[PDB]
């Protein structure tokens, strides 16, 4: 059991990727023509 | 003679551009430098009398290093920088100031890049980062760092520009222009030997950053590329497999048994 | 450390032989266990 | 003091005997802290010792022996330290002296065993390297002065 | 309340006292475990160490004078008490010095008292006189004096506290003589390291190697450290797993800054596996995981974006998470924005030097993305999708990339198209041979150590 | 004194080496005779 006092604790003053969203692409401009 | 007149002569010869005269003057100085015990900045003694000659030794070594670099004496420049190392990289505020510090360190880093010793370059870059605040802000120190980063990326177009734009900015890097440009050119040649097939020589002349076709053809002949109609065609231990591995697996299985 | 002459000789060699004794005694005890079981 | 051995190392290539002597003297007192960088160019110090025209080859041999001893090759350190002759101290309080003496007597015992294997009658008055035999004899005489009769007899056996 | 603390301390010292008769490495490991336990609740407190020293150290012991000077220079409630209790305590607590025919404090006992003094000063934030003690007592009088192989582990923790206190004082304050002090400390530590290696102990050499490496890294000197470890062997015997983890982490640092990323990754994974996962070890684990992430990114492999959602380590990996996202998307603008934003946090972890080197890898992975999804792609479109400049820069980058392993492609200057070829089937070459050989090696050595550990209860059966 | 301790430790080591080689050889021949006895029974 070592306290690891040389390395201080930093101070502060089912999932993989899919971090972006496609939103409403729709793209009805093709349907315009 | 004595130290002071030797320093005066060294300074005058440097201001006159007589680098050979400076290189002649240096060996006499070092004997009395040793006699006065000034070469090693002894940290045990903090007497100001000892300190006042430390910047004199700094000046002497800086002139020695510049005389070496202007006389194509990279080895002697390395030796003088090593002798200067304790003076610069120390907490001694009176000792660790020099208007020529950035120039000397940048010259050392460019020399390290010229010897294509990238490991040494990165290690010393970490050293200088830890020992100097705001490393990237200094343009003179930024020069070798930028030349390394843009070379690692591959944007030699921004690197060959920097080498040609170095010009008078520091006025000492002109001694290193040839070797760095040669390294850039041979690196680009290595890159092109594997990527392009049937590359016209006219585009090669500008791709390799050359100036006239004759040097391009000579360089291609040095690399042994055929020049058929100016259309360069590049063309171009561990263990016995199966046996060794299977036998070793059998040995490991049966030895422990 | 300090001292020199004959005494450091025998002290160091005794230390080396003691380490050899410890490791080899452990190995011998393991081997004896397997031998006795078999 | 110094944090890197390169400052004093740059002197080791130069020509003037005075700067070589000063560099060898300075490195000897600080080789403890920086054995790695000094060990990087060990051929240079070895060649300095090899040259006969040098006026301080003994200190070069001693410093090379210290570097080798710090490395781990104790036999080469024993070989070089004996070649340092008078420069290699025998009575100073240091781990280097104790370890070099112990390894020297290691080698002396092995070589004398070989000698008595082939030349059984005697170790012979001069076959062994004179420096090693002299060191062994001086060490056992010193232990005799300290009234270590039993250990002296044992090591002689 | 002082009485119970004194009795507990005396029980601990008796536990360490048995080694003088046992002459064995045991009875000190349990002592250090109980010592950490005592420091956990501060049961050593204060004014009880003074009582213990007064009733234990005889006046003939020169160490007692300096120890009393340093623990408290004002408390003078010198209790007579057990002043006659000399033969009452077991003889393990003393030793009749034949030189002067006087009893004296046992060597291990004295070292334990000095260690306790170090611990009390460290846990009272009294750093100045802590470093004064470091430079005045333990170094010049204790460590240089006891040439015994039974001390061992005591010297390791003592050295650890010496270096830790010195570094904390040096970094915290700002003086001008710290250079010579640091040089002297490094020289002393390395001399003691050589002495310990020659005396053939194991824990002290390992701890001194760790301390020297930490000093080299904190100073910034790297190449000297790289040559230093290359000419030494870190023993794997009697060494606790914590020391191994420390050494492997520092070795990973050293091999990482010098562009040896494979070795750095292997050593950092070994360090991660060799470290305790208790809550008290969280800081070291976090500092190692940051570097593991940096090494994985720099080697080319993109870390799986779920270990960023780990335990309490998760709150500090956010800058590295954004960097990983920027690399995965291969966008130089986002990478530059993240680097500029978290520059201070990246340098405070001493990884900013490593992280700036990621700029090349961003270009490499961008070219990999635009070469895996484009059999034949116009150079202008490559430039646009790479957010870059005129055709020449793209050509230079591509020519660099294809000869640098990645992008098994081919460039033709006719009309700006990089006609990349297909990928050779990996299950047609000798690479699976190598992968399976590595796996078999690991499994076989694992089974071998498994059997060698299993074998002992056969005798214990 | 010290020399006697060194020689005694050397003798103990050498005897122990004898013991180790004995035990290894006996392990191998116990394997052999175990197979033989299993067959004989």
Curated annotation (Swiss-Prot), chain C:
It comes from the Eukaryota. N-acetylated by NAT1. It is found in: Cytoplasm; Nucleus. Transmembrane segments: none annotated. Coiled coil: none annotated. May form a homodimer or a heterodimer with a related family member. Interacts with OLA1, TMA17, and UBR1. Belongs to the AAA ATPase family. Present with 4700 molecules/cell in log phase SD medium. The 26S proteasome is involved in the ATP-dependent degradation of ubiquitinated proteins. The regulatory (or ATPase) complex confers ATP dependency and substrate specificity to the 26S complex. This is 26S proteasome regulatory subunit 8 homolog. It comes from Saccharomyces cerevisiae (strain ATCC 204508 / S288c). The lineage of its organism: Eukaryota, Fungi, Dikarya, Ascomycota, Saccharomycotina. The chain holds residues 14 to 51 of 405 of the full protein.
Curated annotation (Swiss-Prot), chain D:
The modification N-acetylserine is found at residue 1. Transmembrane segments: none annotated. Coiled coil: none annotated. It comes from the Eukaryota. N-acetylated by NAT1. Interacts with UBR1. Present with 4750 molecules/cell in log phase SD medium. Acts as a regulatory subunit of the 26S proteasome which is involved in the ATP-dependent degradation of ubiquitinated proteins. Belongs to the proteasome subunit S1 family. This is 26S proteasome regulatory subunit RPN2. It comes from Saccharomyces cerevisiae (strain ATCC 204508 / S288c). The gene is RPN2.
Curated annotation (Swiss-Prot), chain E:
N-acetylated by NAT1. Residues 245-425 form the PCI domain. One of its GO terms (biological process) is regulation of protein catabolic process. The keyword Thylakoid does not apply. The modification Phosphoserine is found at residue 429. Coiled coil: none annotated. Keywords: Acetylation, Phosphoprotein, Proteasome. The lineage of its organism: Eukaryota, Fungi, Dikarya, Ascomycota, Saccharomycotina. The gene is RPN3. Pfam families: PCI, Rpn3_C. One of its GO terms (molecular function) is enzyme regulator activity. The 26S proteasome is composed of a core protease, known as the 20S proteasome, capped at one or both ends by the 19S regulatory complex (RC). The RC is composed of at least 18 different subunits in two subcomplexes, the base and the lid, which form the portions proximal and distal to the 20S proteolytic core, respectively. This is 26S proteasome regulatory subunit RPN3. Belongs to the proteasome subunit S3 family. The keyword Acetylation applies. Acts as a regulatory subunit of the 26S proteasome which is involved in the ATP-dependent degradation of ubiquitinated proteins. InterPro entries: 26S_Psome_reg_C, CSN3, PCI_dom, WH_DNA-bd_sf. Present with 16700 molecules/cell in log phase SD medium. GO terms for cellular component: proteasome complex; proteasome regulatory particle, lid subcomplex.
From Swiss-Prot, chain F:
N-acetylated by NAT3. The 26S proteasome is involved in the ATP-dependent degradation of ubiquitinated proteins. The regulatory (or ATPase) complex confers ATP dependency and substrate specificity to the 26S complex. This is 26S proteasome regulatory subunit 6B homolog. It is found in: Cytoplasm; Nucleus. Coiled coil: none annotated. The chain holds residues 46 to 86 of 428 of the full protein. Belongs to the AAA ATPase family. It comes from the Eukaryota.
């Amino acid at each position: 059991d070592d306290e690891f006092e040389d390395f201080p604790i930093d101070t502060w003053a089912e999932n993989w990727d899919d971090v972006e969203v496609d939103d409403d692409f729709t793209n009805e401009l093709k349907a315009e023509l | 003679p004595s130290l002071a007149e030797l320093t005066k002569s060294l300074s005058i010869a440097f201001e006159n551009g007589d680098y050979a005269a400076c290189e002649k003057l240096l060996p006499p100085i070092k004997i009395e430098l040793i006699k006065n015990n000034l070469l090693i900045p002894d940290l045990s003694i903090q007497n100001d009398i000892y300190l006042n000659d430390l910047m004199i030794t700094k000046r002497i070594l800086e002139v020695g290093a510049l005389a070496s670099i202007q006389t194509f004496n990279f080895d002697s420049f390395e030796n003088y920088f090593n002798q200067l190392k304790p003076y610069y990289f120390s907490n001694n505020h009176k000792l660790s100031e020099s208007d020529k510090k950035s120039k000397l360190i940048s010259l050392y880093l460019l020399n390290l890049l010229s010897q294509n010793n990238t490991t040494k370059f990165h290690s010393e870059l970490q050293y200088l980062d830890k020992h100097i605040k705001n490393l990237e802000d200094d343009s003179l120190l930024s020069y070798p760092i930028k030349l390394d980063r843009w070379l690692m990326e591959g944007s030699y177009q921004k690197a060959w520009d920097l080498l040609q734009s170095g010009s008078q900015n520091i006025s000492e890097f002109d001694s290193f222009t040839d070797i760095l440009k040669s390294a850039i050119r041979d690196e680009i040649a290595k890159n092109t030997e594997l990527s392009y097939d049937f590359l016209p020589l006219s585009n090669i002349k500008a791709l390799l950053f050359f100036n006239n076709e004759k040097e391009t053809e000579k360089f291609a002949l040095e690399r042994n590329w055929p020049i058929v109609n100016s259309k360069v065609y590049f063309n171009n231990d561990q263990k016995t497999n199966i046996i060794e591995k299977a036998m070793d697996y059998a040995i490991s299985i049966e030895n422990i048994v | 450390t300090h001292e020199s002459g004959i005494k450091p000789y025998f002290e160091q060699k005794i230390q080396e032989t003691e380490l050899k004794i410890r490791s080899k005694t452990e190995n011998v005890r393991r081997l004896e266990a397997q031998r006795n079981a078999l | 003091s110094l944090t890197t051995a390169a400052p004093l190392l740059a002197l080791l290539r130069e020509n003037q005997d005075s700067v070589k002597t000063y560099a060898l003297e300075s490195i000897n007192n600080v080789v403890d802290q920086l054995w790695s960088e000094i060990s990087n160019e060990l051929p240079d110090i070895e060649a300095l010792y090899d040259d006969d025209t040098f006026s301080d080859r003994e200190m070069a041999a001693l410093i090379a022996s210290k570097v080798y001893y710090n490395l781990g090759e104790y036999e080469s350190a024993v070989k070089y330290a004996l070649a340092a002759k008078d420069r290699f101290d025998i009575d100073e309080k240091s781990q280097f002296v104790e370890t070099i003496v112990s390894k020297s007597i290691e080698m002396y015992v092995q070589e004398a065993s070989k000698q008595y294997t082939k030349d059984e009658q005697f170790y012979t008055k001069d076959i062994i390297d004179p420096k090693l035999t002299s060191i062994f004899e001086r060490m056992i005489e010193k232990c005799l002065k300290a009234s270590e009769l039993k250990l002296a007899l044992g090591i002689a056996l | 309340a002082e009485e119970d603390q004194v009795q507990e301390l005396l029980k601990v010292l008796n536990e360490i006292s048995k080694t003088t008769l046992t002459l064995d490495p045991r009875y000190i490991w349990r002592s250090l475990k109980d010592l950490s336990s005592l420091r956990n609740q501060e049961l050593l407190n204060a004014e009880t160490l003074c009582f213990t020293v007064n009733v234990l150290y005889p006046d003939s012991s020169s160490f007692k004078k300096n120890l009393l000077k340093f623990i408290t220079s004002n408390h003078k409630s010198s209790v007579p008490g057990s002043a006659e209790l000399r033969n009452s305590y077991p003889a393990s607590f003393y030793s009749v010095n034949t030189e002067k025919k006087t009893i004296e404090v046992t060597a291990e006992i004295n070292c334990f008292m000095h260690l306790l003094v170090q611990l009390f000063l460290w846990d009272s934030k009294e750093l100045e006189q802590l470093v004064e003690f470091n430079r005045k007592v333990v170094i010049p009088n204790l460590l240089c004096y006891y040439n015994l192989r039974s001390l061992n582990l005591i010297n390791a923790k003592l050295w650890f506290y010496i270096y830790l206190s010195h570094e904390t004082l040096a970094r915290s304050s700002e003086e001008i003589n710290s250079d010579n002090q640091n040089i002297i400390l490094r020289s002393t530590m390395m001399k003691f390291l050589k002495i310990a290696s020659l005396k053939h102990d194991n824990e002290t050499k390992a701890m001194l190697i760790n301390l020297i490496l930490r000093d080299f890294l904190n100073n910034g000197e790297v190449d000297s450290a790289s040559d230093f470890i290359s000419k030494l062997e870190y023993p794997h015997t009697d060494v606790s797993s914590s020391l191994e983890a420390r050494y492997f982490f520092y070795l990973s640092k050293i091999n990482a800054i010098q562009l040896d990323y494979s070795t750095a990754n292997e050593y950092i994974i070994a360090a991660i596996r060799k470290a305790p996962h208790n809550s008290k070890s969280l800081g070291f684990l976090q500092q190692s995981n940051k570097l593991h992430c940096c090494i994985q990114l720099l080697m080319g492999d993109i870390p799986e974006l779920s270990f960023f959602h780990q335990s309490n380590m998760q709150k500090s990996l956010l800058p590295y998470y954004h960097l990983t996202k920027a690399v995965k998307l291969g966008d130089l603008k986002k990478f530059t924005s993240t680097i500029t934003k978290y520059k201070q946090l990246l340098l405070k972890d001493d990884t900013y030097q490593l992280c700036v080197r990621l700029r090349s890898n961003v270009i490499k992975t961008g070219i990999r993305i635009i070469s895996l999804t484009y059999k034949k792609i116009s150079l202008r479109d490559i430039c646009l999708k790479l957010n870059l400049d005129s055709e020449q820069t793209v050509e230079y980058m591509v020519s660099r990339a294809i000869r640098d392993g990645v992008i098994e492609a081919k460039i033709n200057h006719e009309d700006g198209f990089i006609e990349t070829t297909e990928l050779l089937n990996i299950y047609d070459s000798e690479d699976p041979q190598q992968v399976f050989d590595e796996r078999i090696k690991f499994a076989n050595q694992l089974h071998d150590e498994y059997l060698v550990s299993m074998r002992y209860p056969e005798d214990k059966k | 004194d010290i020399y006697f301790k060194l020689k005694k430790l050397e003798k103990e080591y050498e005897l122990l080496t004898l013991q180790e080689d004995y035990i290894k050889d006996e392990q191998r021949h116990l394997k052999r005779e175990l197979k033989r006895a299993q067959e004989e029974v």
